[PDB]
Write a protein that binds this ligand. Structure first.
Ligand code: VVT
Ligand code: GG5
Length: 339
């Protein structure tokens, strides 16, 4: 029961998709792939279709293609991008060389919004609430996003929000300091730091920490939150990092009420809990959702967690054809969601 495909060329890329998807219109592109908005005749929905770029180019790409397909097949949550469909024009494993992913079309990203609008407190609460509700789910599957930033948050005209796990200004601006320090044992709360940076930006209209490089970025972080205290200092194994850090002029933690002057004091309070230098002390997603700032949205019986996610594949060292074959299997075993 294979559909009928049709071929077409858009912005240099060749697109071979089933007849059900019509009016392909390019939305954008990048290193990993390109996306077209389209209309899906079978559901009456507007959808986005992503064509992966060179999915089986190297062991790295093949693994990554596998990773993305596995993740997207597992994410089933209102605030996380998931899969309506996945297909390949290939008729067998031998000719398999392209992968297309389909999801609900989301017309904008949070970057398109914060930069072309000033948001009310109510919108900040709704957007951040949704980020946290999706991160709760993601984190419950032992996944760390690691790259939250405005361009990874798809938003529609209804203000509904979904976290994009894989995309296609600077990433470092939203990155937790432990990563600017290269710590190899950072946890899920790296994502909470990013959400804090995002919330700050929606509240003020300005990037909280617009570093020019990795050093400047850490310098701007410490200027707001202060240099590490003795308890945090004790956890740094790297003699170089310690030197670097103990060798800068000491700085105190600023008063967030004075820095975020005029913002709702509940939002300020939450920010303080999110932008803690010590990751062991940052608030978690589930904790943040119960914070009083979200009383008009928080509903503990409607903040689901995820089904277990098997990430053992991540520690495997396989051949391209193996990763390719595993991916083909995932394409074939796909079951779309309900009407
Ligand atoms: Cl940057 C980006 C955006 C999209 C997308 C999703 C929804 N609406 C518009 C754009 C996607 C994407 C991910 C999976 C399937 C299809 C597109 N992948 N990456
Ligand atoms: F300057 C800084 C900035 C951040 C950290 C930090 N926060 N959470 C964890 C760490 C950390 C950094 C490096 N090694 C261990 C732990 C430590 C020092």
């Amino acid at each position: 029961e294979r559909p009928t495909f049709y071929r077409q060329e858009l912005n240099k890329t060749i697109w071979e998709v089933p007849e059900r998807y019509q009016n392909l219109s390019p939305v954008g592109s990048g290193a990993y792939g390109s996306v077209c908005a389209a209309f899906d005749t079978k559901t009456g929905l507007r959808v986005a279709v992503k064509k992966l770029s060179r999915p089986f180019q190297s062991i790295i790409h093949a693994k990554r293609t596998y990773r993305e397909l596995r993740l997207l097949k597992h994410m089933k949550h209102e605030n996380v991008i998931g899969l309506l469909d996945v297909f390949t024009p290939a008729r067998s494993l031998e000719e398999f060389n392209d992968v297309y992913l389909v999801t609900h079309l989301m017309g904008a990203d949070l970057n398109n919004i914060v930069k072309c609008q000033k948001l009310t407190d109510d919108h900040v609460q709704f957007l951040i609430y949704q980020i946290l509700r999706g991160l709760k789910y993601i984190h419950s599957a032992d996944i760390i996003h690691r790259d939250l930033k405005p361009s990874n948050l798809a938003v529609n005209e209804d203000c509904e929000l979904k976290i994009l796990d894989f995309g296609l200004v600077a990433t470092r601006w939203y990155r937790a300091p432990e990563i600017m320090l290269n710590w190899m044992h950072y946890n899920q709360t790296v994502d909470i730091w990013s959400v804090g940076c995002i919330m700050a930006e929606l509240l003020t209209g300005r990037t909280l920490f617009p570093g020019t490089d990795h050093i400047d970025q850490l310098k701007l972080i410490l200027r707001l939150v202060g240099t590490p205290g003795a308890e945090l200092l004790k956890k740094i194994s790297s003699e170089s990092a310690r030197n670097y850090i103990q060798s800068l002029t000491q700085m105190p933690k600023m008063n967030f009420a004075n820095v975020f002057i005029g913002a709702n004091p509940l939002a300020v309070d939450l920010l303080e809990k999110m932008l803690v230098l010590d990751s062991d002390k940052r608030i978690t997603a589930a904790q943040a959702l119960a914070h009083a700032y979200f009383a008009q949205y928080h509903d503990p019986d409607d903040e689901p967690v995820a089904d277990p996610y098997d990430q053992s594949f991540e520690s495997r060292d396989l051949l391209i054809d193996e990763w390719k074959s595993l991916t083909y299997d995932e394409v074939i075993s796909f079951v779309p969601p309900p009407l």
